[PDB]
Amino acid sequence: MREVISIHVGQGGIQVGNACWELFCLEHGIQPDGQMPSDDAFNTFFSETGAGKHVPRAVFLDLEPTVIDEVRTGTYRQLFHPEQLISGKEDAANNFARGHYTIGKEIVDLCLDRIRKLADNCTGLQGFLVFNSVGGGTGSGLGSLLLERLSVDYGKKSKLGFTIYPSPQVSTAVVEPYNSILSTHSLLEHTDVAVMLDNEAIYDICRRNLDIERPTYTNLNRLIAQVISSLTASLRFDGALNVDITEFQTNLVPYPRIHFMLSSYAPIISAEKAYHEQLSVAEITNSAFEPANMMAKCDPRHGKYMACSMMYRGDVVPKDVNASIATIKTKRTIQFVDWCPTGFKVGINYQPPTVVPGGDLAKVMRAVCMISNSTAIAEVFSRLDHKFDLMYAKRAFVHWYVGEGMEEGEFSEAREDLAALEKDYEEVGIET
Amino acid sequence: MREIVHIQGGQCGNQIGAKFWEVISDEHGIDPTGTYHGDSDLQLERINVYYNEATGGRYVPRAILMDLEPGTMDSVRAGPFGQLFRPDNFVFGQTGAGNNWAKGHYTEGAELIDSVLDVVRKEAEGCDCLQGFQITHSLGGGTGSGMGTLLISKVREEYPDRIMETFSVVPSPKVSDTVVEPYNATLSVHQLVENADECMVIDNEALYDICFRTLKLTTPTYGDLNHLVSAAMSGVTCCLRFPGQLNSDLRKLAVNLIPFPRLHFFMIGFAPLTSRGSQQYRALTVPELTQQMFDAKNMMCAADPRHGRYLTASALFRGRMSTKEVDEQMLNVQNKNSSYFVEWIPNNIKSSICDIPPKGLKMAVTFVGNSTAIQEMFKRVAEQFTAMFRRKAFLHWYTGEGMDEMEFTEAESNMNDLVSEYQQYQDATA
Amino acid sequence: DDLAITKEEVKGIVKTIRQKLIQKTKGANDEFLLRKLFKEFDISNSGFLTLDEMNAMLIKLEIPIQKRYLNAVFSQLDRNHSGVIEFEEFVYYIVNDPYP
Amino acid sequence: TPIDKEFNQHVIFNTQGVQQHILFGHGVTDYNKREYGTSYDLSFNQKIKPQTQIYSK
Amino acid sequence: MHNYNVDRKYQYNCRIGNWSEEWELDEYKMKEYLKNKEKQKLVSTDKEDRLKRSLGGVNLSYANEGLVKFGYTVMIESDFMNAVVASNIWDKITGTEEAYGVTVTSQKEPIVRTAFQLLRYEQDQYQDDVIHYGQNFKIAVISRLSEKPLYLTSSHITPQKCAKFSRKQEVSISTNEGINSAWCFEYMDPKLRYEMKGQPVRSGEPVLIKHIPTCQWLATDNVQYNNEFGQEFEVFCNSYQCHNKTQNLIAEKVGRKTIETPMRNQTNQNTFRIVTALYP
Ligand SMILES: Nc1nc2c(ncn2[C@@H]2O[C@H](COP(=O)(O)OP(=O)(O)OP(=O)(O)O)[C@@H](O)[C@H]2O)c(=O)[nH]1
Ligand SMILES: Nc1nc2c(ncn2[C@@H]2O[C@H](COP(=O)(O)OP(=O)(O)O)[C@@H](O)[C@H]2O)c(=O)[nH]1
Numbered sequence A: 001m002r003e004v005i006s007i008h009v010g011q012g013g014i015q016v017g018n019a020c021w022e023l024f025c026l027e028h029g030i031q032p033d034g035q036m037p038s039d040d041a042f043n044t045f046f047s048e049t050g051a052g053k054h055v056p057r058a059v060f061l062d063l064e065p066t067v068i069d070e071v072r073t074g075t076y077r078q079l080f081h082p083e084q085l086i087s088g089k090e091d092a093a094n095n096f097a098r099g100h101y102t103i104g105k106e107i108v109d110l111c112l113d114r115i116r117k118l119a120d121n122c123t124g125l126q127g128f129l130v131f132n133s134v135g136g137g138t139g140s141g142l143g144s145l146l147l148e149r150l151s152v153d154y155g156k157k158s159k160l161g162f163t164i165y166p167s168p169q170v171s172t173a174v175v176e177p178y179n180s181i182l183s184t185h186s187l188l189e190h191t192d193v194a195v196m197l198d199n200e201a202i203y204d205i206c207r208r209n210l211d212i213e214r215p216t217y218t219n220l221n222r223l224i225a226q227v228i229s230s231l232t233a234s235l236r237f238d239g240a241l242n243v244d245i246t247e248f249q250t251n252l253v254p255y256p257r258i259h260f261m262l263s264s265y266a267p268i269i270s271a272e273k274a275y276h277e278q279l280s281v282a283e284i285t286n287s288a289f290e291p292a293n294m295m296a297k298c299d300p301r302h303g304k305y306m307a308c309s310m311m312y313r314g315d316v317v318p319k320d321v322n323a324s325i326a327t328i329k330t331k332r333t334i335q336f337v338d339w340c341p342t343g344f345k346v347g348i349n350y351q352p353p354t355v356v357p358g359g360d361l362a363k364v365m366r367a368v369c370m371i372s373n374s375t376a377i378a379e380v381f382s383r384l385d386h387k388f389d390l391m392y393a394k395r396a397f398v399h400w401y402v403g404e405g406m407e408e409g410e411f412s413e414a415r416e417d418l419a420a421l422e423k424d425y426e427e428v429g430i431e432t
Numbered sequence B: 001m002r003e004i005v006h007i008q009g010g011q012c013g014n015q016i017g018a019k020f021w022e023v024i025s026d027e028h029g030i031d032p033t034g035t036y037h038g039d040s041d042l043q044l045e046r047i048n049v050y051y052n053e054a055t056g057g058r059y060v061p062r063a064i065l066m067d068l069e070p071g072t073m074d075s076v077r078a079g080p081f082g083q084l085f086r087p088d089n090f091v092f093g094q095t096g097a098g099n100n101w102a103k104g105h106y107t108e109g110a111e112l113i114d115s116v117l118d119v120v121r122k123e124a125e126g127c128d129c130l131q132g133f134q135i136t137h138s139l140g141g142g143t144g145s146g147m148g149t150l151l152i153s154k155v156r157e158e159y160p161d162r163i164m165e166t167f168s169v170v171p172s173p174k175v176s177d178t179v180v181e182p183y184n185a186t187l188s189v190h191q192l193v194e195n196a197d198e199c200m201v202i203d204n205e206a207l208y209d210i211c212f213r214t215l216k217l218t219t220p221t222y223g224d225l226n227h228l229v230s231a232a233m234s235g236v237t238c239c240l241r242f243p244g245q246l247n248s249d250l251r252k253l254a255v256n257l258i259p260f261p262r263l264h265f266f267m268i269g270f271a272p273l274t275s276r277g278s279q280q281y282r283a284l285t286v287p288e289l290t291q292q293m294f295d296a297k298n299m300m301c302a303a304d305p306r307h308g309r310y311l312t313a314s315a316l317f318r319g320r321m322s323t324k325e326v327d328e329q330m331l332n333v334q335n336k337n338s339s340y341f342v343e344w345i346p347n348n349i350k351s352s353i354c355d356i357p358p359k360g361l362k363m364a365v366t367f368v369g370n371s372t373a374i375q376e377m378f379k380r381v382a383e384q385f386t387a388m389f390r391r392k393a394f395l396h397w398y399t400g401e402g403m404d405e406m407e408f409t410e411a412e413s414n415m416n417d418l419v420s421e422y423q424q425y426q427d428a429t430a
Numbered sequence C: 001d002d003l004a005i006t007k008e009e010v011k012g013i014v015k016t017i018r019q020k021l022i023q024k025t026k027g028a029n030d031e032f033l034l035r036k037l038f039k040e041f042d043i044s045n046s047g048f049l050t051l052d053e054m055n056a057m058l059i060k061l062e063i064p065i066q067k068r069y070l071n072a073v074f075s076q077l078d079r080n081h082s083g084v085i086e087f088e089e090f091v092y093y094i095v096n097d098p099y100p
Numbered sequence D: 001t002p003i004d005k006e007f008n009q010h011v012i013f014n015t016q017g018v019q020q021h022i023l024f025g026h027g028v029t030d031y032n033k034r035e036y037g038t039s040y041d042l043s044f045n046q047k048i049k050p051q052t053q054i055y056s057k
Numbered sequence E: 001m002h003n004y005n006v007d008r009k010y011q012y013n014c015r016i017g018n019w020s021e022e023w024e025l026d027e028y029k030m031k032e033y034l035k036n037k038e039k040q041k042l043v044s045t046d047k048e049d050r051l052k053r054s055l056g057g058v059n060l061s062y063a064n065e066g067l068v069k070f071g072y073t074v075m076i077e078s079d080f081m082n083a084v085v086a087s088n089i090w091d092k093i094t095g096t097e098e099a100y101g102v103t104v105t106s107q108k109e110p111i112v113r114t115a116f117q118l119l120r121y122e123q124d125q126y127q128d129d130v131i132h133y134g135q136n137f138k139i140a141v142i143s144r145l146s147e148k149p150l151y152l153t154s155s156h157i158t159p160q161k162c163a164k165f166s167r168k169q170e171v172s173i174s175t176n177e178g179i180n181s182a183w184c185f186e187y188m189d190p191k192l193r194y195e196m197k198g199q200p201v202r203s204g205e206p207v208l209i210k211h212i213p214t215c216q217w218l219a220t221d222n223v224q225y226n227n228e229f230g231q232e233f234e235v236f237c238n239s240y241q242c243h244n245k246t247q248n249l250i251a252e253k254v255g256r257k258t259i260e261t262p263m264r265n266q267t268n269q270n271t272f273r274i275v276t277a278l279y280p
């Protein structure tokens, strides 16, 4: 009765949705062809065809056929609906103007119609889930355009954003500072929940925990799949305290302009060291709050804490949950803001985490995933604005944007709104 | 799907195109008769990029061979892999150029441009979604440097949105084949700065140094130089032709490597290159590849790259690899060579990954970079041009076909302006 | 015997298959479409095609021909009577034939 | 001069014919090994351990 | 500080400089030659394969009382060139259908390539095996050359498809089963055209060969043509009639002559010979 709609745009969005849907089908026991072996906890992600397979409530978007047709040729060709894998004609080529003003216009309408058709079938729609790459052309382009269209088409339906921002020193493109700024402006007024998913912060986690010295994007995506599953398992599995997506835009964002949060995941252990570790609730809770364990390259010790929501899955006990929370409050190096005396929202799920064969993560009886709203996120915006202006001063690479049909004055408000947000975060942290 | 058409002119253009077509046919598993006899399905889903489709179970390249003398094309027709090209794409004159820019651009080029324009146009609307162009020619020759550039001007007039790339081999003062190369070199390069979206320079002396120092082969010909150029070419569109983890196409490369409209001149290089002796004695790995990529003596241009500063650079990685080591090597080399990278732009190097390694290799990298060291060749050619023009030597041949000295003056003035505004960014500070 | 397959319905069948190919992709195409499947499964790469492959081949391109009708068209196509049909001859008959 | 025909291909194949033999200058006991496989082609379906690929040998 | 390319150089046997690189390069050339020997793709090995199978032996069928009959293996010779006809399977004609050209070869030594068979195209009233004049028949190739039976056919003249050199009506060896394979025998003397109908044909005498759908007489001309086995000449179909005209419509209008009897002679380029075995 409760369903969510997943949106995957850009190369990063496609390559993370692939892993997340693989884990979803494996967890729900749905074969890659789409049929259960048969030898109502799946409506949130799959819809019955009356007699036969289960079809996902997901849509794929990209303006190049490379990633799309590979899925069409892979082992999942019978699973996805043939006409909901939208493929374009020309790559955006790391340009914001194309994906937002010229070539996305004739593709967004088809996506809107497909989303209309998908949502008409659903009767108890809960919200939206969007996965996009910000440092990319069509990723930031359509994602902004689709968010703009959705905010006026549906309105009050909540939407949650898992965006991948560029890392401080880990980077691929050179013109990524430009289109990164604009997407932030586009999403600031239109996305209810935003989560940081940079790459370096996960790179170090692998070396520290799983002892992986040669990682690739596959390890990156599978962890994000675990995060999404631990976030959404409350909808589809029983537990002591069920938490809907409604108590996210109600328990984590004190002000409408303040909705940028970052997450962490624990435990992260390999298959060899699992049997020698206590792995009790107290240890896993402490590991979540470690600054080096954060999913985003941002140190919380430079800012306060506003609101944290953590979801437990497995055989956890309220005693263990409450005991660790008391110790966390007592210990000093983690600090909260004065005007928020209570800052924890805990949800309990009885289902243990599901481990995919062929992965690095080992089978564990307990896990915790938490989302934290802090004031330290202003640092990543500070370093992004500096990189922006340091090369915008000479108006480099601008002609690539204006010559495609883009107004030069657009960068003006993109700069000032980001500074306003930075000073909002700075002002919130002052004590009364 | 985003297929690209090929244009080549002159003897140099014909040889480069023939070798490139041979290499790409070997990569795609194409028989000399045009029949596919590969083993994978990965060589078919993107075959339309380079080969058109005809009856009889055969594939035909979309290449045009254009020249004023039929000798080179008649030879390549009888040569190996000479049956792939349609005879209708062979267009030739009966007079030649005599290595004269005026003859190649005004007298016979004007009357011969119609057929090549017609064939390139029909090939253009042949494809549903055109992507761009790629050119091979010699700026030191007459027919190529004149008539190919005239075709460049016409096609840029006709299609303003599509991309166009030039792989131009320019004369070098160390070896002089003709006594009037600076004239037509300056006249040609005057016309590329406003038309070519991408320009990539190649030096015969640089290739000779590569052969003598890395390959260490005693007897070189033009064939191995042609193979090196063809490998450099095939490395560019590997991500476009094959699946990978991070696909980057020509226009992504352009927008990521071009800071300003008049700075579209690039330097290229290819790795790994080794002598036949130690082929099995070194490890092919990310650090070794990235260390040999940025070698000063490995470049395809005679210009010394450590006398200038890099603006932007691009690396196109091939083979099954991991992103951590690639990006860590990029960051490490950028940090270690902070004196050789311009300070007012952060992270000025681009990395892309293609999962299909080339023939006979497991890892390969194609390097394209834009640096302020390119201007040395422009300085030297301008000095030679001024020295040879101050005495008005050999000017009557050019001016006997309506050419005027004022256009030569404009060409040299534009060269000087480009050199000045290209070298000023080296000393420009934030 | 109930009935023997007649030339009338043989012509009907061969017209049905011949038109179905035309709809797919473009006009210059569909010959490589036919060829790539034979490249996919002709492991012994000898160029000789069998009756069991015919059923499998037509199953792939959305034409489930009846076994009796498939036998009739298979028998009518070949004159060698060896139960093996050359692939290029089959392609020629299906595509490059002035008469139905 | 006799210059029998067989000697011609023998020398152009071994005694510096004015070409090079099928990219073997760029090669790397025997190297043809047309090798191909992408991340999604094997990792998601063949279920191959993400460390097991690359791994030059 | 051992340096290379020091002016004049000896061979790789000495150790003057860069000897290892050329020796290693020379070594790999033989290894690549060995690999090309390992897989059956040597350019050398291909030409003996075409040498042996084309130049194979065959026994020519003997003719009794100089009368040819169906099922024989006979020679076809053109007296104008004094040469026998042959077929080159390796050379493929330019057409959608797979057809192979035929040329006439000066050497008269009996080979498999120049060995041919004749067979009854379709049932005729003449139940006897002896062929009579004006009886349709089709030429067939020896079964050892190709497992598929191949026939000699010729398609109508078209600006699109014509002879490579003669530019006229062209002949080819094709797998076609149609009426185009039909041929008929024909006499030399212009006076005995209509009389010899239904009469047995003998071997060793000159004879004409005529195509039924086109009524064009097969012949050869002195135009140079080349293939794997040296230099030869082409064959085709053409009416090599006399140039001088006759007031023939006047003849029927008055009532002196008739259409069936021809009024024009032809040159000897169209004449051909049937050669059988010398010994039984
Ligand atoms: N973590 C992670 N990031 C990815 C992955 N794929 C792409 N990205 C991010 O995407 C950025 C490059 O843009 P892409 O996503 O590849 O391309 P795009 O967003 O579709 O935009 P265009 O290139 O114009 O098509 C990189 O900087 C990465 O940070 C992935 O598999 N995992
Ligand atoms: N790399 C390369 N350079 C060549 C080749 N052929 C000629 N050149 C160079 O081109 C110059 C002469 O160019 P030219 O033949 O007059 O140009 P064209 O008249 O347009 O064909 C010489 O200095 C050569 O070094 C070749 O096959 N490869």
Ligand SMILES: [Mg+2]
Residues within 6 Å of the ligand: A010, A011, A136, A137, A138, A139
């Ligand atoms: Mg992309």
